[PDB]
Amino acid sequence: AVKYYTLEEIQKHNNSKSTWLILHYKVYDLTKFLEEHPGGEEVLREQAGGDATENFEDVGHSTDARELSKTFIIGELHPDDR
Numbered sequence: 001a002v003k004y005y006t007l008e009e010i011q012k013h014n015n016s017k018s019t020w021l022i023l024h025y026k027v028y029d030l031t032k033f034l035e036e037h038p039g040g041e042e043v044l045r046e047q048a049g050g051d052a053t054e055n056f057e058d059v060g061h062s063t064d065a066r067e068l069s070k071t072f073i074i075g076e077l078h079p080d081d082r
C-alpha cells in the first residue's frame, strides 16, 4: 500500500515540531534529521512544507545521500496535486 498526502496537508508541517518536504513526488519527514544533515538545518527549514526537488538536485547529492534519504519517506504526493 502507499499513503498519499495533499499539498495542503504537507504545508502544515513546517514548525519546530515537524518538518516535511517533497522530493520527486515523495514526502519525507526530516524532523529528526535536521541536526545530522551535513548541509545544515537552515537549508532544510527554508524548504519545509514544500517541494525542494530542484534545490536538492542543484547541489547534486551523492549516491550515499540518496540511499539514506529513502529511510525518511512516509508517502507520496497525491496524484491530483501533481
Ligand code: HEM
Residues within 6 Å of the ligand: 021, 023, 028, 030, 037, 038, 039, 040, 043, 044, 047, 052, 055, 056, 059, 060, 061, 062, 063, 064, 065, 066, 068, 069
Ligand atoms: C532528503 C534528505 C537529504 C539527505 C539524506 C541529505 C544528505 C546530505 C549529505 C549526506 C550531504 C553530504 C554530501 C553528499 O553526500 O552529497 C549533504 C549536503 C548538502 N545538502 Fe543535503 N540531504 C538531504 C536534503 C537536502 C535538501 C532538500 C537540501 C536543499 C534544500 C540540501 C542541501 C544540502 C547542501 C547545501 C549540502 C552541502 C553541499 C556543499 O558542501 O557544497 N540537502 N546532504
